Each structure stands twice: as structure tokens, then as C-alpha cells.
RNA sequence: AUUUUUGGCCUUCGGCGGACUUCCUGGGCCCAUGGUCGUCUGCC
């Protein structure tokens, strides 16, 4: 399938994204762009060796994002179907 | 008037002449420092032409560097002000009532304070 | 005006010795004769030898032949042609 | 090709190891794949090697492991793939 | 009568330009509302600075309050600026850059 | 868009490249991907020693800075 | 094209500054700029990360190794930013 | 031609050397793609000119593959 | 949609090098090109004014506050 | 598939070369007699 289509189908859910600079951003996604530029709502971001912070809206680039973890109760099979 | 969230939002946020973000609440006659979280992060604070009597009750603002509480009625400095603003570099309190040796000792014990303005004071 | 593609084609036709210092590594070189090329500057050199130079005086420390080695265009950085002594 | 191998692994639902260039290993069964080498997997075991430093001296390596319910790996972060 | 004033005879023998600009900005903020302060380390800018306030009346009041004020052991001579301030023109939106390529 | 290397053609230029390398030579040509080939190239490290290599080419990604040492 | 490309084209041929990915920061008279971030400048001064401030009568820069640019306030507040 | 070289080295004993750690992987490469992605079977990885061990089915992308040769 | 809604507003962007640029972002381009005015770079804090950030170095961005009040809004009628 | 979006990265710094600038030296931005400054490579 398509990764962008899968992200759009699995959007509006609480996910945690690990960015390759050692960052961890946890929150519910508000919008997912076709270029993996996901905008999240009520996000908490903690960098590597830095104190965590909370932001209402934040955008993370797909190239800068290394990995993503969605909720365990999300219907992955229904989203990929 | 009282320092409220609407007054903090209507305070003039612009760029200072020293190339820094400055929030000024002049002409509001704030009796005390309040709604610091509503004001948010500001590098310079300008509470000139106000009626602030206590120099304190500020939130955790490490980004604050410049403070100008001149032309006010501040007579004492709270001990939590240096903890709330440990990175403050410029402090101006001209034409105020701050003339205490304890206030001078607190200003000296402030670690990042480099510029001090205390003219026209007892 | 000699383009880089024309220069690479002329070097491949002449089969002259070429040493290519790799990208992000000033002490790694590949010495040989260019036999093939692509649009992404993928140079395949026959009888190639990988040379690891010393970090102090930039002298040749280790040399190891590998035969036909295909070097990536992003991997290869600085290619210089050396004229043989006839 | 690699896309056919990823599709076969996703169809077989067999555990595979993805080596990420930041020194990471991810053992997980293949569930989804993309054209840009981006994969979605379930029940992922993440392993890494850490070298603590005590009093300015390098210590012995330690293997750290963690479990994730659902994970997504990008093709840029993924360096190597091994099918088991 | 203008919102910009020129301060001359300033101490610039060994005082740092950034420190002098910060001190002038702090003094202007204590005296009133200040929009911009410019002080370079050129030959004509040695000891000469330009202070543009928020209003012409505020600038005149600040000049009257700090006329002949001693700054770092040296009095500063305050005079009316012969030209408009660039920051004031940028704030007003009618700024016209010069056509000369100097 | 091809690079504007026509003014730097047939001129002595020094190219600063990553790894602190200075390649000084007469520019012979250029491509659309900023790939410059220089004749009579001399490579110099930070120590200041210059070693001649002959005719060399620099890739577009490998080339960082270019500066003509003569009038242009 | 792009709004940043148009802004760079408008800011070309003036006193500007550039910061590169290698750490060297230059300031000077930028002359020619391209839509593919190809900048040609004359009369610039470039300072390295640890000292090493020199001059440059001619400099060619590409956006692959360039990090950021600093342009004039007139170019920032030019009429191209007006609402449609 | 790199494409003809990869076609000739398909299902052949090839060694791919990475750009980090001086690591090499030698084995029977079988599957190749247009994005320079190489899948090999019964591959063995070696580090610093010393064998590290056999892995098996190994897929290497062009982002991690630096050089390729035929054994 | 989201980029158009959050354009010309107070945003803070953290790059791959860790430097954070905060200010009124005014222009956005789909190659992750952000053109902002009165930018402040924190690594030590400095002011740069007009700045352009490319996606080759930009890592993440967030909306720190809404759009600021205009000079006419500040000096409005009485 | 080289200049944005599918990363040429993983990732310590001491004996220490070379900086950079901060304030607090002395003299007339200039020169010596400065001292500090904590982020950079670096040298063995």
C-alpha cells in the first residue's frame, strides 16, 4: 500500500514519533501531509539531553522523523484494508 | 488598572533597540506583577509609568534578560525574583523607593546582573 | 570547455591511471583504470586498488587490490588522472 | 527485488531484523511496506548497545532491549534488512 | 523639534560600543519610551549616537531631562537631529532608500 | 539550471572542499550539475604543502566553495 | 517557482549575509542568485567557525552546503507578501 | 555500465563494502533493483578484515552501500 | 491547509544542529522553505532579522503563538 | 540517483597547536605588561 495513505487512515490518534536527533514527541496527530509532514495537537517533545516541553501545535518533517509508534488499539488491518 | 489577561494581551510586544523581544505595559498603572504566564516568554519587560510596589511574584522566565520597572513605587525586592529570573542581565529601577541595603545585597547576589540603573533614588 | 562527462569519457577511452579520493574521507582512495560510467557518476574501475593513507604525512600506508570495483558517484569525490611514464 | 522480498516477508508474517544506522536493531514481523522502504510492523523488539562512562573511563558494553506494540520504520533510518 | 536626537561628546576612548549602546538604551528606557538607538565605531560615529524615541514630545522631554547628563564620567551634548530616523521611517512605512550605490 | 561558470572558465581558481582541501588550478569546463574539471590542479591540506596532480575533476556535491584568484 | 526563490532573487545584488553548513559565515555584496540556490557574490568577508576571517573578491556557493541567508528589511517587507 | 555490471553480478559471488566501520558483506547476490538495492543469500559480514559471521538473506540499500566488487 | 492557517504567525523551528529560530514566519514553500522576519536564533541568543530556513537543515517546527498585532492595530483610532 | 523530502554516518577528548570574544590591566579604536572567558577543531 501507500505509507501516506496509511498515515492518513491512521491519523487522529495518539502516537509517539522518535526523531533521529534523539527527540521523542508524543501526542495526537491533527493533520498528515502527503510528504510525511505530520502536524500534531497537544504534543509533548523531549530532545536528547534537554528538558521536555509542551506545545499546542507542532510540525515534524518526515526526513527528520526516524520512527513512529501508533496506539496498540488502532485498527491497523482496517486502516491498511 | 489591575493587570489582567486582557491587559497582558493588549500590552505592546515589539523589538527592543538592543535587538530583543520587549513587552511593555506602560500606561496601565499595574499595582502588582501578575499574569506572567498569560504574558508568556519575554526577553525584556517594561513596566514603566506603573504603580508596582513589590518587585516579585514572577513566574519561571529564564529567557528574561532586561527589566525596566522605572518610574514606579517599588520599595522592596522579593527573594524569589532572582530565582524566577536567574538570567536577567539589565535591571533598571530609576525613580523608585528601592533604597535598602538588603535590596543592594540581592542585586549583588543576582549572578547574571551586569547592567544596573538606579539613578534618582535614595 | 570540457564537460565532466566528456572528460570521464576521454579518460575511459585513454585508459589512463586515475586515483579517486572518496567523499567524507580524505585518506581513502581508489586507484585504477575506469571501464564504465553511468548517469549517477557510478564509475566501475577494473584492477582497482584501495589505498588507506596515513593521517600524519598523508603517505600511502595500506594498499589492497580488489579487481573490478564499482564506486558510487556520491562515494567518489575527487578524481585525478596521472600520466604514465613511457 | 527488495520490494518483492518485503512483500513475501509481509505475506509470510515472519520475524525479520532491521538494522538502523544509529546502532539499532529491530526484530519484528513484517506487516506493511512502502516503495520508499518504509515498513509498518507489530510486536517489535528494539535492541541497542550502550557503553557507560564512569569517572572518565569507558565501561563494558551493555545490551538494552525494549518492546513496542506497533512501530513504523523509515527507509532513510533503515540501513540493513535480514529475513529470518 | 523631532523624535530623533543626536548625542555627542560621548566617552569612546576605551568604552565598548555594545556596552555603550546598552547603557544608552537603558538610560533612554528609564527616561521614557525609546524606539531605536544607533551608535557605531566609525570615525564620524566615535562619540556620536542617534536616539529615536516613540514620540517627538517624549524625545524632547528626555532631552530636557538628560541635557548635559554625565555618562561614564563624560557629559553628553544632546541636540536636535537634522534628519529623520531610518527606524522611524520604517515604522511609518514611508521609508525611501537612497538610489546612490555607496 | 546549469551553473554560471562561464565567467570562471579558463581562469585560475581555488576550490575549497570538505576535509579541508584546497584544489588550485585553471578551470577547463563545467556541467549542469556543478561538476567542474580543472587543469594543472594542485591539492593543499591545512599544513600548506601543495602537491600537483594534473588534470582533475570535482563533483557537484563534493565542491563546496570556489574562488578565482585572478581578475574576472 | 517559490516565494523564497523570488525573495532570494529580489535580495540578490545587495549587501547580504550567508551561513553555510560547513560553519563558515560570509557577509558581503551578493551579486547573482539562482532558483536552484546558486549564489555568486563579489566583495564578501568570510569567517570560519574558530577565527579565520578572510576576504573574497569572488565566491560561488550552492544551497546543498548553505544553511541560511540574511537579507534586507526592504526585501523582507517587499510588496510580494501582500494578501491576494 | 553500472547497470550491466549489476546484471552480470546478479546471482553471483559479490562483496559489498559499506562507508562506515570498514564493514563488508560477501555472498551470492541474486536480487537487484533500479535503486541500487542488493539482496544476497548466504551472506557473511566481516569487520576490519576479520570475519564477523554469516547472516543469510541480507538486503543492502544504496544509502549504506559504498562499493561493490566480484569475488 | 494547516500550513496556510499557521502561516504569518509566531513560530519556533528547531533545526538538525539544535539551533532554534523563533519569530514571525511569513512565507512557506512546499520544499520546507520558511521565510521569517525578526528571527531570533538560540543555541546564546542573537537576532538576525529576515531569515530563510531550508528543509536541508530544518528538522521540526511549532506554532509558539498566534499572529501578532499590526502597527495599525497598536495605533488604532480612539 | 549529486543543490531541500528518503541522511556519508556512527560518534571521547586529555599532554595539548591554533583560535574566538566577553568583561576586569596599563598607555595613546591604537600599542604593550594584560588577566580572564568555554565553546571549537587540534596536536600525541
DSSP letter at G81 equals G
DSSP letter at F3 equals -
C1'-nearest nucleotide to the CA of A37? J5
Closest alpha carbon within chain C to F48: C57
Q: What CA–CA distance (Å, rounded) separates F36 from H64? A: 26
Interface test with D, best of H56, H57, H59 (most D CBs within 10 A): H59
- Say if CB D74 and CB A69 are below 8 A apart: no
The experimental resolution of this structure, in angstroms, equals 2.8
Task: Please return the burial class of B101, using the count of CB atoms within 10 Å of its CB with bins 0-12, 13-18 and 19+.
Answer: exposed
Closest alpha carbon within chain E to B94: E30
The rounded Cα I62 to chain-centroid distance in angstroms is 9
Q: What CA–CA distance (Å, rounded) separates F9 from F27? A: 5
- Say if CB A27 and CB A42 are below 8 A apart: yes
Closest alpha carbon within chain E to B67: E26
Nearest 5°: CA angle at G9, between G5 and G15? 125
Whose CA is closest to F20, among G61, C26, G58?
Answer: C26
Beta bridge mates, C32: C18
D touches which chains (3+ CB pairs under 8 A)?
Answer: A, H
Q: How many helices (H) and strands (E) does chain E have?
A: 3, 6
**B43 C-beta neighbours (distance < 10 Å), count:** 23
Interface of G with E (CB under 8 A): 73-74, 77
Chain C residues close to F45, C-beta within 8 Å: 26, 58
Q: Residue B22: helix, strand or coil by DSSP?
A: strand
J40 C1' to I10 CA distance, Å: 32
Residues with Cβ within 8 Å of A52's Cβ and at least 6 positions away in sequence, in order, are A44, A45, A46
Chain C residues close to F21, C-beta within 8 Å: 26, 78
- DSSP sequence for G36-57: TSEEEEEEEEEE-SSS-EEEES
Beta bridge mates, G16: G28
Q: What CA–CA distance (Å, rounded) separates I75 from H70? A: 76
- Our CA dihedral for A35, A37, A38, A41, rounded to 10 degrees, sits at -150
**Residues in chain G preceding a C-to-N separation beyond 2.5 angstroms (breaks):** none
H touches which chains (3+ CB pairs under 8 A)?
Answer: C, D
Long-range contacts of E16-24 (CB under 8 A, 24+ apart): E17/E41, E20/E49, E20/E72, E21/B17, E21/B18, E21/E49, E22/B18, E22/B90, E22/B115, E23/B115, E23/E71, E23/E72, E24/E49, E24/E51, E24/E71
Whose CA is closest to C31, among C6, C56, C53?
Answer: C53
Parallel, antiparallel, or unpaired: how do β-strands C76-81 and I9-15 relate? unpaired
Residue C53 belongs to what H/E stretch? strand C43-53
Task: Please return the burial class of C76, using the count of CB atoms within 10 Å of its CB with bins 0-12, 13-18 and 19+.
Answer: buried
Q: What CA–CA distance (Å, rounded) separates B27 from B106? A: 28
Chain H residues close to C36, C-beta within 8 Å: 1-2, 4-5
Interface of F with G (CB under 8 A): 1, 3-5, 8, 18, 34, 60-61, 63-68, 72
- DSSP sequence for F17-72: ETTTEEEEEEEEEE-TTS-EEEEEEEEE-TT--EEEEEEEEE-TTTEEEEEESS--
Task: Please return the burial class of I23, using the count of CB atoms within 10 Å of its CB with bins 0-12, 13-18 and 19+.
Answer: buried
Give the orientation angle of helix E17-31 with respect to helix E56-65, to 10 degrees: 110
Whose CA is closest to F53, among F31, F9, F22?
Answer: F22
- Characterize B6-18 residue by residue with b for buried, 16 or more Cβ atoms within 10 angstroms of its Cβ, and e for exposed: ebbeebebbbbbb
Q: What CA–CA distance (Å, rounded) separates B81 from B60? A: 9
Residues with Cβ within 8 Å of D24's Cβ and at least 6 positions away in sequence, in order, are D46, D47, D48
Closest alpha carbon within chain D to A2: D34
The rounded Cα D68 to chain-centroid distance in angstroms is 11
C-alpha cell at C24: 567524507
Chain B residues close to E25, C-beta within 8 Å: 16-18
DSSP letter at A81 equals -
C1'-nearest nucleotide to the CA of C75? J8
CA distance to C27, F42, G41, I43, per residue, from F53 (Å): 16, 6, 29, 42
- Say if CB D75 and CB D38 are below 8 A apart: yes
- Say if CB A9 and CB A79 are below 8 A apart: yes
J38 C1' to G49 CA distance, Å: 15
C touches which chains (3+ CB pairs under 8 A)?
Answer: F, H
- Say if CB A30 and CB A40 are below 8 A apart: yes
- Our CA dihedral for B40, B46, B50, B54, rounded to 10 degrees, sits at 70
How close, in Å, is residue E95 to chain B by CA atoms? 18
J2 C1' to F36 CA distance, Å: 13
How close, in Å, is residue A67 to chain D by CA atoms? 5
Experimental approach taken = cryo-EM
- Our CA dihedral for A29, A31, A34, A37, rounded to 10 degrees, sits at -60
**A19 C-beta neighbours (distance < 10 Å), count:** 24
The Cα diameter of chain A in Å comes to 40
Amino acid at each position: 500500500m501507500k505509507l501516506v495513505r496509511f498515515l492518513m487512515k491512521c491519523a487522529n490518534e495518539t502516537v509517539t514519533i522518535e526523531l533521529k536527533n534523539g527527540a521523542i514527541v508524543h501526542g495526537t496527530i491533527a493533520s498528515v501531509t502527503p510528504k510525511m509532514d505530520t502536524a500534531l495537537r497537544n504534543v509533548r517533545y523531549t530532545p536528547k539531553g534537554e528538558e521536555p516541553y509542551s506545545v499546542e501545535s507542532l510540525t515534524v518533517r518526515g526526513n527528520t522523523i526516524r520512527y513512529y509508534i501508533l496506539p496498540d488499539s488502532l485498527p491497523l488491518d482496517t486502516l491498511l484494508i | 488598572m489591575r493587570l489582567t489577561a486582557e491587559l497582558i494581551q493588549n500590552s505592546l510586544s515589539y523589538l527592543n533597540p538592543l535587538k530583543e523581544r520587549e513587552l511593555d505595559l506602560r500606561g496601565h498603572r499595574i499595582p502588582a506583577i501578575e499574569n506572567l504566564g498569560v504574558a508568556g516568554p519575554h526577553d525584556a519587560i517594561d513596566l514603566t509609568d506603573n504603580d508596582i510596589q513589590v518587585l516579585g511574584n514572577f513566574p519561571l522566565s529564564p529567557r528574561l534578560r532586561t527589566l525596566l520597572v522605572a518610574r514606579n513605587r517599588v520599595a522592596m525586592i522579593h527573594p524569589t525574583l532572582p530565582n524566577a529570573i536567574p538570567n536577567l542581565r539589565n535591571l533598571v529601577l530609576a525613580s523608585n523607593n528601592l533604597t535598602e541595603l538588603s535590596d543592594l545585597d540581592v542585586l549583588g547576589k543576582f549572578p547574571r546582573l551586569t547592567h544596573l540603573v538606579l539613578m534618582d533614588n535614595p | 570547455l570540457l564537460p565532466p562527462i566528456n572528460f570521464l569519457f576521454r579518460l575511459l577511452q585513454q585508459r589512463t591511471p586515475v586515483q579517486i579520493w572518496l567523499y567524507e574521507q580524505l585518506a581513502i582512495r581508489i586507484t585504477g583504470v575506469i571501464r564504465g560510467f553511468d548517469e549517477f557518476m557510478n564509475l566501475v574501475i577494473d584492477d582497482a586498488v584501495e589505498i588507506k593513507l596515513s593521517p600524519k604525512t598523508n603517505e600511502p600506508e595500506s594498499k589492497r587490490p580488489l579487481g573490478q570495483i564499482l564506486l558510487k558517484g556520491d562515494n567518489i569525490s575527487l578524481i585525478q588522472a596521472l600520466s604514465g611514464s613511457a | 527485488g527488495p520490494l518483492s522480498l518485503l512483500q513475501t516477508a509481509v505475506r509470510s508474517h515472519t520475524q525479520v531484523l532491521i538494522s538502523v544506522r544509529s546502532g539499532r536493531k529491530l526484530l519484528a514481523r513484517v506487516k506493511a511496506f512502502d516503495r520508499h522502504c518504509n515498513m509498518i510492523l507489530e510486536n517489535v523488539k528494539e535492541m541497542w548497545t550502550e557503553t557507560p562512562v564512569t569517572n572518565g573511563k569507558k565501561g563494558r558494553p551493555v545490551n538494552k532491549d525494549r518492546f513496542i506494540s506497533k512501530m513504523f520504520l523509515r527507509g532513510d533510518s533503515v540501513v540493513i534488512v535480514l529475513l529470518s | 523639534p523631532n523624535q530623533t536626537l543626536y548625542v555627542t561628546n560621548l566617552p569612546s576612548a576605551k568604552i565598548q560600543k555594545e556596552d555603550l549602546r546598552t547603557a544608552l538604551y537603558m538610560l533612554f528606557s528609564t527616561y521614557g519610551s525609546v524606539l531605536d538607538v544607533v551608535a557605531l565605531k566609525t570615525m564620524k560615529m566615535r562619540g556620536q549616537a542617534h536616539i529615536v524615541y516613540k514620540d517627538i514630545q517624549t524625545a524632547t522631554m528626555a532631552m530636557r531631562a538628560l541635557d548635559g547628563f554625565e555618562f561614564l564620567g563624560r557629559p553628553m551634548k544632546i541636540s536636535y537631529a537634522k534628519g529623520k530616523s531610518h527606524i522611524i521611517a520604517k515604522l511609518d512605512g514611508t521609508f525611501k532608500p537612497p538610489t546612490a550605490a555607496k | 539550471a546549469q551553473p554560471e561558470l562561464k565567467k570562471y572558465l579558463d581562469k585560475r581558481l581555488f576550490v575549497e572542499l570538505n576535509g579541508s582541501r584546497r584544489v588550485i588550478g585553471v578551470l577547463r569546463g563545467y556541467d549542469v550539475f556543478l561538476n567542474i574539471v580543472l587543469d594543472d590542479a594542485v591539492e593543499e591540506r591545512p599544513n600548506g604543502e601543495k602537491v600537483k596532480l594534473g588534470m582533475v575533476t570535482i563533483r557537484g556535491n563534493s565542491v563546496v566553495i570556489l574562488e578565482p584568484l585572478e581578475r574576472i | 517557482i517559490g516565494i523564497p526563490i523570488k525573495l532570494l532573487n529580489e535580495a540578490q545584488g545587495h549587501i547580504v549575509t550567508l551561513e553555510l553548513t560547513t560553519g563558515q559565515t560570509y557577509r558581503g555584496k551578493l551579486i547573482e542568485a539562482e532558483d536552484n540556490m546558486n549564489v555568486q557574490l563579489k566583495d564578501i568577508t568570510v569567517t570560519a567557525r574558530d577565527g579565520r576571517v578572510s576576504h573574497l573578491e569572488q565566491i560561488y556557493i550552492r544551497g546543498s552546503h548553505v544553511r541560511f541567508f540574511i537579507v534586507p528589511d526592504m526585501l523582507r517587507n517587499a510588496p510580494m507578501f501582500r494578501s491576494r | 555500465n553500472p547497470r550491466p555490471f549489476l546484471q552480470d553480478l546478479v546471482n553471483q559471488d559479490v562483496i559489498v563494502r559499506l562507508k562506515w566501520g570498514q564493514t563488508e558483506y560477501k555472498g551470492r547476490l541474486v536480487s537487484i533493483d533500479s535503486y541500487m538495492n542488493i539482496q544476497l543469500a548466504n551472506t557473511e559480514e566481516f569487520i576490519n578484515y576479520k570475519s564477523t559471521g554469516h547472516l543469510g538473506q541480507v538486503l543492502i540499500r544504496c544509502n549504506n552501500v559504498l562499493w561493490v566488487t566480484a569475488a | 491547509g494547516k500550513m496556510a492557517g499557521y502561516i504569518n504567525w509566531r513560530m519556533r523551528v528547531t533545526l538538525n544542529d539544535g539551533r532554534q529560530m523563533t519569530g514571525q514566519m511569513l512565507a512557506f514553500d512546499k520544499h520546507m522553505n520558511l521565510v521569517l522576519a525578526d528571527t531570533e536564533e538560540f543555541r546564546e541568543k542573537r537576532t538576525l532579522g529576515l531569515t530563510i530556513v531550508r528543509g536541508a537543515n530544518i528538522i521540526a517546527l511549532s506554532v509558539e503563538s498566534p499572529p501578532p498585532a499590526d502597527p495599525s492595530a497598536r495605533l488604532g483610532k480612539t
